[PDB]
Design an enzyme around this catalytic site. Structure first.
Site, PDB file in Angstrom:
ATOM      1  N   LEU A   1       0.808  -1.213   0.000  1.00 47.92           N
ATOM      2  CA  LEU A   1       0.000   0.000   0.000  1.00 47.92           C
ATOM      3  C   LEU A   1       0.845   1.269   0.000  1.00 47.92           C
ATOM      4  O   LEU A   1       0.645   2.189  -0.804  1.00 47.92           O
ATOM      5  CB  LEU A   1      -0.887  -0.007   1.255  1.00 47.92           C
ATOM      6  CG  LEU A   1      -1.563   1.327   1.574  1.00 47.92           C
ATOM      7  CD1 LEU A   1      -2.582   1.696   0.488  1.00 47.92           C
ATOM      8  CD2 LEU A   1      -2.213   1.205   2.915  1.00 47.92           C
ATOM      9  N   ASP A   2       1.788   1.300   0.936  1.00 48.89           N
ATOM     10  CA  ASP A   2       2.574   2.464   1.274  1.00 48.89           C
ATOM     11  C   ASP A   2       3.902   1.945   1.819  1.00 48.89           C
ATOM     12  O   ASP A   2       4.050   1.774   3.029  1.00 48.89           O
ATOM     13  CB  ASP A   2       1.836   3.306   2.340  1.00 48.89           C
ATOM     14  CG  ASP A   2       2.710   4.401   2.952  1.00 48.89           C
ATOM     15  OD1 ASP A   2       3.647   4.905   2.270  1.00 48.89           O
ATOM     16  OD2 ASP A   2       2.443   4.771   4.122  1.00 48.89           O
TER      17      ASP A   2
END
Lengths: 445, 445
Positions: A123-124
């Site tokens: 995601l990140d």
């Protein structure tokens, strides 16, 4: 078919095993330290399962060589061990982690070995890069200038499940979450760099409007300046990446700071399982353990925003049992003792949902001098009796990238990351098509 | 088994028909003006379906007499027709509506007829009364004083579905929603009555904190003073019932007010399908139809909170197409023309969810002089491909009350309402047990 090895026993492991094992032409092997974990993670899909010590070079080579790719979902300090083994065995690797200096050191051998090590694809980092690169590429191709890049992300309870003093739930540790508002931050604003000291970060926290329904606040991350070179936006005047929390979170943490409760110095007040009210009496130098006297010593130390906030924060302390006879977890310092109580009281319950929110906001100046603002926004919720959004938004990009490494959609060799439309487009398309996960792209009217 | 007649073709009708028809010993007949509506509402459950004109006394008697109870989910101005028929036929009645003066006039005949007319049993009124009475009864029984009663309720998009300029979706009309911030309000505060004029209501709107995740604002309803006699809380210093909206809603409406856009005076500018930008040019006396000139005339009329809000509101006007060539719905006045555009652009889409939020907050002073605050909180979401929360939270209490009228758990005869634990307890218990709908009860720490 293809043989996939998965290293890991986090909640992130479950959707990856499950979505990959559902494919008839993929054979997943789950590897954890203990056979039973792996048999349990593997059980739903009837996957192969083994035990494995990643520090044992021979054990690690044996199993990598039995597979076409290894997904490393273990702590990032171990990726070098995995990659050294992948170099020896000529096995491809996929991680969700930021490329570490240890991996960069191995990079010429990765290339010589002819393997693909795909990185930074959860995601990140991961989803954020896909969509940031997408818009910046579109803006540059049309002769546009990216004047401002703002990017904010948080993993939070669904709002209906947010009723605790922090609007935050732990899975599982709280120490980093708590200290985040005591970090420095460096970013670009209006054509200059701004840095915020540890002490001054708190005061930077401010509302950040995304959609009417949500009450978000944000603070900047440690370093946003790296995104200028990473996304090649030398023309950007403003470049800020930050974290989203719900309203009230910074003020709560600030009160705890003012009380000395984020200090990690060895302190005998926290050495033994005494009552919270006695611990605070000693620590704050209160007259007694009565709620009244404890609050007096807090009041004498704290700067409150207003009476409503004071009432809210003190009520939260009460909820936490800080004014009560509940016995502390004897961690030997204020911080860890606090963290133990937060962790004990603020976990997810079985019918509760988590949420991931990520928004990029781009301020563009076109060639003709006209300006526009675009947003790219993801809101995603966990599923009760299914996967959390925190698991799914890491696990699904990882699974997609693994399949693309296996089938050569992602073309190596090398130490790769989602930094270009060529790698990024297929992942974004499959993430939307297969899982319904995508960032909504809008121009601000 | 038992024969239930349902009058209505609103979205509220569906869960009532469906949950009742699922019972083997209940035979539902759906009645609407058109046979096809009723056959469609009845189709999922295979219920009997008929057409019916409620103003036709003979047609109405014929079908009531064929049934044991009638659920009236049609506009409240028609309940008297239904009740007159129920008196003639000796049929019990259930509604979700506030008891009207017309029904009070019929009350002695209802009693003489030996029928039970159950009223005010949806969400608001209904569920709110159940839980308000519950706590006040508990407080009084323990010798406590109810010093403060606050109660706030809203039907809103789920936060993830709230991204429009009002954070509000219409099902279906917007006129009342819009004019609500131009009503007067009367309530109790600190042992005195306060009244707010139509003009001054806007300025009363303020954040109302329930859970960290949500950004609610609230404003008071037209009259809260009635709850003193209704719940018998003569000792209450503060009694306020209000409506929840999301942040930004009042400021948006205020800007529209300042522009004259909530005026319903016949005005030829809105007589014919001209472009929105031309309509606004004429109405605001702008220099031209350019966005720049339209904004200039708005700026000259509007008081903005700050530049961020100004930017937000003007962007919302742009989103609405007010600065565009889109043709107005020619409603002949500013207000209705505005409402038509709001309605056209701000409906639910098929994968979107609504939400009901209701919170009572009680400030209590106990006999010993100790004080406490309690909350009772409901958050409920619609189900995609199922029932909206707005439908379910009205329909389920109505269905439960109907079954209790049928089996004599609710004992009449008379014109009854959920005002006492004897009627209320069984409904609350069944609402929680059968549907999982209940208000979370907490003491503020």
């Amino acid at each position: 078919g293809k043989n996939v090895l998965l290293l890991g026993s986090g909640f992130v492991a479950q959707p990856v095993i499950d979505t990959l094992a559902a494919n008839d032409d993929i054979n997943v092997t789950v590897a954890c330290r203990t056979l039973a974990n792996a048999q349990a993670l593997a059980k739903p899909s009837g996957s192969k399962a083994i035990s494995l010590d990643v520090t044992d070079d021979s054990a690690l080579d044996k199993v990598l060589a039995d597979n076409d790719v290894v997904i490393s979902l273990i702590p990032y300090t171990f990726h070098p061990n995995v990659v050294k083994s992948a170099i020896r065995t000529k096995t491809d690797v996929v991680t969700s982690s930021y490329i570490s200096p240890a991996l960069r050191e191995l990079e010429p051998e990765i290339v010589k070995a002819g393997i693909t090590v795909m990185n930074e694809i959860g995601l990140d980092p991961g989803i954020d890069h896909l969509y940031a690169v997408k818009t910046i590429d579109e803006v540059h191709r049309a002769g546009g200038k990216l004047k401002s890049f703002l990017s904010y992300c948080g993993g939070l309870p669904a709002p209906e499940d947010s009723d605790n003093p922090l609007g935050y739930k732990f899975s599982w540790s709280s120490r980093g979450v708590l200290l985040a508002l005591r970090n420095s931050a460096k970013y670009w604003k209006d054509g200059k760099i701004e840095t915020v000291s540890s002490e001054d970060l708190m005061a930077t926290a401010k509302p950040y409007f995304i959609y009417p329904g949500y009450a978000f606040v944000c603070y900047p991350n440690r370093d946003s300046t790296l995104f200028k070179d990473l996304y090649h936006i030398p023309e950007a005047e403003t470049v800020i990446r930050g974290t989203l929390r719900y309203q009230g979170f910074p003020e709560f943490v600030k009160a705890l700071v003012d009380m000395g409760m984020l200090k990690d110095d060895a302190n005998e007040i926290f050495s033994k399982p005494i009552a919270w009210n006695e611990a605070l009496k000693q620590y704050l130098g209160a007259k007694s353990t009565s709620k009244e006297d404890l609050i007096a010593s807090i009041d004498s130390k704290a700067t409150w925003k207003d009476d409503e906030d004071r009432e809210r924060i003190l009520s939260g302390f009460a909820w936490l049992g800080l004014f009560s006879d509940a016995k502390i977890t004897p961690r030997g310092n204020a911080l860890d003792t606090l963290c133990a109580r937060l962790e004990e009281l603020m976990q997810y319950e079985d019918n509760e949902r988590d949420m991931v929110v990520l928004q990029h906001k781009f301020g563009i100046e076109w060639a003709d001098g006209t300006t526009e603002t675009r947003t790219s926004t993801l809101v995603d919720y966990g599923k009760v009796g299914g996967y959390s959004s925190m698991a799914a938004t890491v696990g699904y990009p990882v699974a997609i990238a693994t399949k693309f490494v296996l089938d050569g959609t992602i073309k190596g060799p090398g130490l790769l990351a989602p930094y270009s439309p060529e790698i990024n487009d297929p992942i974004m398309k499959e993430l939307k098509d297969k899982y319904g996960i995508y960032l909504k792209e809008k121009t601000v009217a």
